[PDB]
From Swiss-Prot, chains A, B, C:
Keywords: Acetylation, Allosteric enzyme, Metal-binding, Mitochondrion, NAD, Oxidoreductase, Transit peptide. This is NAD-dependent malic enzyme, mitochondrial. (S)-malate binds at residues 145, 401, 446. Gene3D superfamilies: Malic enzyme, N-terminal domain, NAD(P)-binding Rossmann-like Domain. Homotetramer. Divalent metal cations. Prefers magnesium or manganese. The keyword Mitochondrion applies. It comes from the Eukaryota. InterPro entries: Aminoacid_DH-like_N_sf (IPR046346), Malic_enzyme_CS (IPR015884), Malic_N_dom (IPR012301), Malic_N_dom_sf (IPR037062), Malic_NAD-bd (IPR012302), Malic_OxRdtase (IPR001891), NAD(P)-bd_dom_sf (IPR036291). This isoenzyme can also use NADP(+) but is more effective with NAD(+). It is found in: Mitochondrion matrix.
Amino acid sequence: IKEKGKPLMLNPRTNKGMAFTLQERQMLGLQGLLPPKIETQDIQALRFHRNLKKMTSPLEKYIYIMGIQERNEKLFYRILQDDIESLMPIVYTPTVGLACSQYGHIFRRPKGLFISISDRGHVRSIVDNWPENHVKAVVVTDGERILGLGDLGVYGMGIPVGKLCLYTACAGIRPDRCLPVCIDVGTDNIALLKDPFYMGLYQKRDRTQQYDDLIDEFMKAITDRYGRNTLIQFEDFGNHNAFRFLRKYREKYCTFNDDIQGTAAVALAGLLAAQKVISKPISEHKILFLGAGEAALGIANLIVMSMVENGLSEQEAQKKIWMFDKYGLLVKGRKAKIDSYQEPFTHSAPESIPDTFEDAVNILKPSTIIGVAGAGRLFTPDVIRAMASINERPVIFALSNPTAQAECTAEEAYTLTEGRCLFASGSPFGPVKLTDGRVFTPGQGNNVYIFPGVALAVILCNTRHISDSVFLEAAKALTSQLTDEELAQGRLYPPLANIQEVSINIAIKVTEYLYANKMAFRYPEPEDKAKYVKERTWRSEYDSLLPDVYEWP
Amino acid sequence: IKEKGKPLMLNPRTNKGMAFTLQERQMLGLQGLLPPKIETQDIQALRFHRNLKKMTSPLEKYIYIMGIQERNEKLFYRILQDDIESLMPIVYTPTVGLACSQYGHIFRRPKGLFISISDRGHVRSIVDNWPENHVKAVVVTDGERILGLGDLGVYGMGIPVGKLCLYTACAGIRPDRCLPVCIDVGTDNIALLKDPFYMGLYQKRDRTQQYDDLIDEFMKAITDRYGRNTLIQFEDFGNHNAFRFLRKYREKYCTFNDDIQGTAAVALAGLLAAQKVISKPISEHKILFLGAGEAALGIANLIVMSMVENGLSEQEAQKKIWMFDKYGLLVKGRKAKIDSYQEPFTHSAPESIPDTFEDAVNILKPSTIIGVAGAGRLFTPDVIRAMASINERPVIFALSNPTAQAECTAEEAYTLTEGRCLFASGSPFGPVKLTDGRVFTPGQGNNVYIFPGVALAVILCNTRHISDSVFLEAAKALTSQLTDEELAQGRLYPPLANIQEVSINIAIKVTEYLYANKMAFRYPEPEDKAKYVKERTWRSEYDSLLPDVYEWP
Amino acid sequence: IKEKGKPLMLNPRTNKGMAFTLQERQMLGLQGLLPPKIETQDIQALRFHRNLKKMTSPLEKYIYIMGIQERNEKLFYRILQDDIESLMPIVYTPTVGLACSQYGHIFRRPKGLFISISDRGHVRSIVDNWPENHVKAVVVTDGERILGLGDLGVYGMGIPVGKLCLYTACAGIRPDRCLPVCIDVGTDNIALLKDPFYMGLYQKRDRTQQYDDLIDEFMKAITDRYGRNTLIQFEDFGNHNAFRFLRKYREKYCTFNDDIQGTAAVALAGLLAAQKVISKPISEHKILFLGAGEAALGIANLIVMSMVENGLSEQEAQKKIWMFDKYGLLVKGRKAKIDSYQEPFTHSAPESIPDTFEDAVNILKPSTIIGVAGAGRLFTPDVIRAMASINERPVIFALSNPTAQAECTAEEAYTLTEGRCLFASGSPFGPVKLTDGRVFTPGQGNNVYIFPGVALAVILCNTRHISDSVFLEAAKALTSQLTDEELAQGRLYPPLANIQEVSINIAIKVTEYLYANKMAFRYPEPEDKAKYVKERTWRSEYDSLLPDVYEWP
Ligand SMILES: NC(=O)c1ccc[n+]([C@@H]2O[C@H](COP(=O)([O-])OP(=O)(O)OC[C@H]3O[C@@H](n4cnc5c(N)ncnc54)[C@H](O)[C@@H]3O)[C@@H](O)[C@H]2O)c1
Ligand SMILES: NC(=O)c1ccc[n+]([C@@H]2O[C@H](COP(=O)([O-])OP(=O)(O)OC[C@H]3O[C@@H](n4cnc5c(N)ncnc54)[C@H](O)[C@@H]3O)[C@@H](O)[C@H]2O)c1
Ligand SMILES: NC(=O)c1ccc[n+]([C@@H]2O[C@H](COP(=O)([O-])OP(=O)(O)OC[C@H]3O[C@@H](n4cnc5c(N)ncnc54)[C@H](O)[C@@H]3O)[C@@H](O)[C@H]2O)c1
Ligand SMILES: NC(=O)c1ccc[n+]([C@@H]2O[C@H](COP(=O)([O-])OP(=O)(O)OC[C@H]3O[C@@H](n4cnc5c(N)ncnc54)[C@H](O)[C@@H]3O)[C@@H](O)[C@H]2O)c1
Ligand SMILES: NC(=O)c1ccc[n+]([C@@H]2O[C@H](COP(=O)([O-])OP(=O)(O)OC[C@H]3O[C@@H](n4cnc5c(N)ncnc54)[C@H](O)[C@@H]3O)[C@@H](O)[C@H]2O)c1
Ligand SMILES: NC(=O)c1ccc[n+]([C@@H]2O[C@H](COP(=O)([O-])OP(=O)(O)OC[C@H]3O[C@@H](n4cnc5c(N)ncnc54)[C@H](O)[C@@H]3O)[C@@H](O)[C@H]2O)c1
Ligand SMILES: O=C(O)/C=C/C(=O)O
Ligand SMILES: O=C(O)/C=C/C(=O)O
Ligand SMILES: [Mn+2]
Ligand SMILES: [Mn+2]
Ligand SMILES: [Mn+2]
């Protein structure tokens, strides 16, 4: 640190509150600016939980917790670390969704970089205004597809902020090396355009070439100042833009799309886990998707790669996958458009064409149902009953977020399948107890289990580009940690309580994969990857800010 | 300002949030660090009120409001200015009392300078650590007598912080020129010495000569760095220390004790307002104090000065004042101690010595009772009834704070006297409506009506020492603003909603008084004292932070 | 010191070079940035004198020593203190005159505040850009009458810098509280307008009301930021502006013109010393001035006050003074103009009207001749012989600066008068040894013997305005320290080598004078004036920059 005095307390990155030791205060010019009391981070943590316990609504807890990030960064992450499972629902889904819809109402301090279309031609000067010098990871959004909430414009900034908190809380990626970014080119959200507290430009979305030029200028500026291997994570972009930007930049920059590729890995990881209680031939595994967008296509493509890696051919593996969107089942020659990415999963219409999703379930009789429509409770009771009849152990994945947009609840799933279903959801659901007396603990199929570990490995390996095979490897690494005892509880994923350890293990598997496949450029190559990764994870414990004082001979 | 970039946002003194104009953002390196939206202070204020409306408890609101002072100082005062009467109960008494009691539990950021006994011999170094260079006003406490709550030690820092906020919100004194100070020599509060969140030294109070040495070191260090005419306001010190320090320093430094002198002026101002409704001869005015400490003695002495000023000699005036403390009536020779300050109001034991305050009222038959004991509801229904039977319009001042320590409530006063009493309290009470339909609106006899205006005048006039006569003048300045109509509602003081205008008027009259008596050293002497003061009051509206850019011939 | 690291070395105010101790380097983040060697100031001083020894020209030395002021301020002043008499000719007259004439050619770094006519209306923002927050002394010039060199415009800035270096070297006034200022409204120096290295605006002098408006804005801005009692010393302004600005502001601000008033004091001090060897009746004291401008009038008015103080009436004392300017003797009705200040010394023509200064001497037969025309050797050998012929001990003062502009040299004065004259010069001349062996040590009648001491006293006493009597007192304080033995050598002033002590003694005397005459506002009044002044003189020895580190009981 080059600073001393009050500035050390005003910057959340360095502020320790009363945790500044006596020696640090005297040598750094803080003596007298702090109460005489010297505290430990442990005392500070207690203070937090004490106040949190008395709080009522989730949003109030969000405002309080996120506020700590702007006062004492170290304490912020220590607090999340004390109990990531109980706080995850507040800083992440579903509460982050509530925060975003009210971002302009709860605003106190801005977080991250804002680049608007009105700054076209001047994006580099904006990137140069960011205080931190060695950024290694960026999460960017334009707020067009915020969770299953739609277009929130600049209010969507809460997502990149939230995603990056997990980069640190889960994988130990250095906070000061993370940059949340919101690209504002307007919003089509009519309500927001009339909101006096809106934080973005009051115009509709610019969809012309300027939008593309802006994104291009952004990628250029970011890498020009921080380096070409700067990890850039695209998050919550509209459907059209998500795929196009991913294809356009994946070979030029170190980038990936979380909604497409991150979701694919976790969803696949769940199927690999379910495979342990079903065992049945993947040949007789019929997958039916509710929705055919970013997440569906991403999941389908990764599943295919898994089947193809296990014998089947890409052609036959795809036939085992069907999709049903807002217009119906995706079949060749249908009236609704079928894009380039969907084609491979669009088959010749069966004898009869299903009118509803329930019908598709009976006609196609799938063994697995994956919901990613962000349209609500479409995995209705009948749909679930049908699945229970058609299968002995049906796989039900209601992945849409936030909670209100989920296809169905864990409660509905288990009770309706008499406890025979294999369930996973995008948002958190507590254990379920049937009138029967059986207890089922649902897993959370959320990419939060993937992007932190993958991001860490990529950053540590100085990786230049991210292939989809990296996600295939991540999916395997996630599931390889699942213990039998946990499958028994109904868990298709490692306990969220161990997400920190699980993420580090993912990073270790990915770093070994990257090196083994000549995709890492960090030299020398470490002999022991496990030791290499663990030694470089950021800790929430306070560091000494004391200058190096020592006697000369 | 010599700072640009993020630091402008991190320092609450300069941070405007989204109110930073586009031009300021581009020229000061803030572009991109704030959302695209440019807001006005009006919008920010609306954001605040909207959120405030939804909060439940007073403590939660205190935490919210005081938190803004640490984020956007300008907005902080804007908020107070929008509705000072509704927030006064939150940032001042009684909620400020609750905040101090839990100061260590709600801690987020420190405010003020902390000087502890362990810093003996190094006080100048601590003072040199305060970031502001032109401090003009200091409010210091050792937290031994916080409101009527007793020894709160370092948790008492809430008072200096609260008083200084009022220096600005009421009198327009510049915030960056105010310095809250807490002297920590330990605490005798057993509960705090076992509180893991306590903010001070874990030791009983040091009452040896080291205490006095530390205070001496403090006075010298503050004046050494900021100037001998730096206003030093003592607040909430213990009884013994309050007087001896006032007597020891008032002729060497620009200092006064708010509890002794400020209270004196507000109470007197109330009695002076009561004469406008009583008219009764001073020869029939007999005052009886519940309590005989800092507030009681200060008030008694100022009342005497007023009487002497209007004819009576000191002796005869002092004869009209009686005191009853925790040991009973102060009569010569009583077993309980009688200090030098009390002696003038300690008379020969009456025919029968009253055992209770009720007996004292019946035996002495005062026309005015003033409560400054900070011990609770001592003005019992019987006490109030006696005053109603003895006097047609009994004067009843229950000035102890916070509300729980008040001698009685407004309801009890007006109801038990059938609307015949002239009431005033230290802490706020709403209007009282009697069964007969009459409505009485009580005034708040709290020194907040005086120290702001008095401080502004002393600072503006470069006054070197403050005499008691100054407080006599402030008292008269305060009451002269009361309007007959308001007096008719039961108001013995101008509406709290006009405290800002009232404080300025007091500042103007005190300024004219300071110059008329050759106590002001600011030269040249302003011709229009009114315009002089009004031109120098700090405003909450945002200032341009733009550099002075102009073209040359 | 709110800064640590490299900045401590880049700022000459704090830079110690290798004198930074090992602990300061470690604690302040300098370890490694300096050579491993720890030096004392003594070693640094030695390094300087060694290098200075090898240098040949005075300007080369000026560039060298003045460069040190921009690298290590403490060392700069230590160096001047090591031998002020040998370096005075380098940093002051006559070399400072050579440096101003080539200021744009030797430029490396700017020194001081520059205010031009192009900034009219924006002077306050310029004053606000000055880095130091507590300025107590300002020396300002418009460069119109630089020494006897005339209009040098912005190249004249070398003067304020010079005078201020002496404030510190002579009186121990704090460097960080001194502010050199140059007002640039153009220049009439044709040679500078065609100089590609000129440092000012390329335009003739603006003599319209805009000039006066700028000076007014400057006075207001300086006092608005630093205080109304901020000492403002006018230096080297043109003859018209000098008197009118002194008269215009002397009762509004704490200001004085060094050329008019400072010279008067030192000139009178030399005459008071001369009377220590002459003693003749003041009735037979006839004074003839070569020149009738700023210095002449100033000296004459002070000579009159001294006489009026010893008996003579104002009118009777003014009759003992004659002046001879560029147009000739000042007599009633002469063709050449005579201003208000000259009238009192413009007498009725004598028997005949002198054509040259030599004729004026033979016709008027004055006992004292004072040169202040800055026009060169006007005190010809014939003028000098005539004075020795008319008087047994002629008093000859050639005060014009620099040397080339002096009226005559010491050699010429003593040799042509056979060692019978009492000589003094504005610029330095070594001792003169006559062929008979008699040695004469000429004193330096230069206001550097006065402004340092007077400024220290005025600053220390918080004096608001400066009366001429102050300089009369300073004149006495100076000569009072002259010893007999030193008078024998031919010194009309104390040795230049003791200028530090002489200046302090003058400050002490002037301080007592200001308190005695109710002109000092610093309270309380020091009992011991000598101790008061001596305790507040800035020292050149290094101060510890270590933060206060100590153990808590
Ligand atoms: N091109 C480069 O490799 C480059 C450029 C500039 C500066 N550096 C600096 O040189 C030092 C050593 O280089 P190295 O390649 O041996 O580093 P390394 O082996 O320690 O790590 C490799 C990469 O991972 C990053 N990293 C490590 N821990 C991280 C964490 N916890 N959170 C986020 N990012 C993390 C580093 O910044 C580095 O770029 C690094 O500390 C780095 O800051 C490297
Ligand atoms: N759990 C996770 O890890 C995770 C990760 C990313 C996204 N998601 C969730 O997936 C959902 C969609 O994300 P996306 O990026 O794929 O969106 P998208 O806009 O790219 O695609 C949405 C798809 O759902 C279909 N759809 C909409 N309404 C429908 C309806 N009423 N009935 C049937 N189908 C309908 C659309 O036709 C479209 O094919 C969101 O709610 C999001 O929160 C979850
Ligand atoms: N950047 C700086 O260092 C800076 C800037 C502006 C003013 N000042 C100081 O202010 C003084 C001149 O001020 P002025 O001419 O405007 O008024 P003034 O001199 O008439 O005011 C008299 C005193 O009241 C103080 N003052 C005025 N308004 C105040 C307020 N609202 N709150 C608290 N204190 C207040 C001033 O500091 C001053 O000491 C100067 O002596 C200077 O030291 C310093
Ligand atoms: N960083 C700062 O701006 C700073 C730091 C320390 C003290 N101060 C000032 O000093 C005053 C306290 O009085 P004090 O004990 O310094 O002395 P003092 O009050 O006895 O001296 C009277 C005046 O002379 C000035 N002064 C003293 N020595 C000086 C010197 N050597 N050169 C130039 N000016 C000198 C002082 O500033 C003061 O205005 C306060 O009014 C305070 O504002 C300012
Ligand atoms: N309204 C205002 O503007 C204002 C200003 C300052 C102080 N106060 C209040 O005045 C109260 C006392 O403050 P202080 O500084 O004078 O305190 P103090 O400790 O100096 O004096 C307290 C006095 O009350 C007496 N007392 C205590 N219990 C008593 C009892 N049970 N019966 C009778 N007398 C009793 C004590 O003997 C003592 O004489 C506090 O509650 C304080 O909040 C009000
Ligand atoms: N030694 C000191 O302490 C000291 C202090 C201040 C000024 N000075 C010197 O005094 C000199 C004049 O300064 P000033 O401010 O009085 O100037 P000024 O311009 O106000 O007056 C100069 C006067 O000399 C007259 N003069 C010019 N040439 C003449 C000539 N050839 N013959 C006769 N008279 C002539 C002019 O008519 C004018 O009246 C400068 O050289 C300056 O260096 C010395
Ligand atoms: O306990 C602390 O020091 C900080 C708390 C917060 O920022 O909320
Ligand atoms: O409205 C704002 O910009 C700030 C709000 C806060 O600090 O609470
Ligand atoms: Mn997403
Ligand atoms: Mn109080
Ligand atoms: Mn000069």
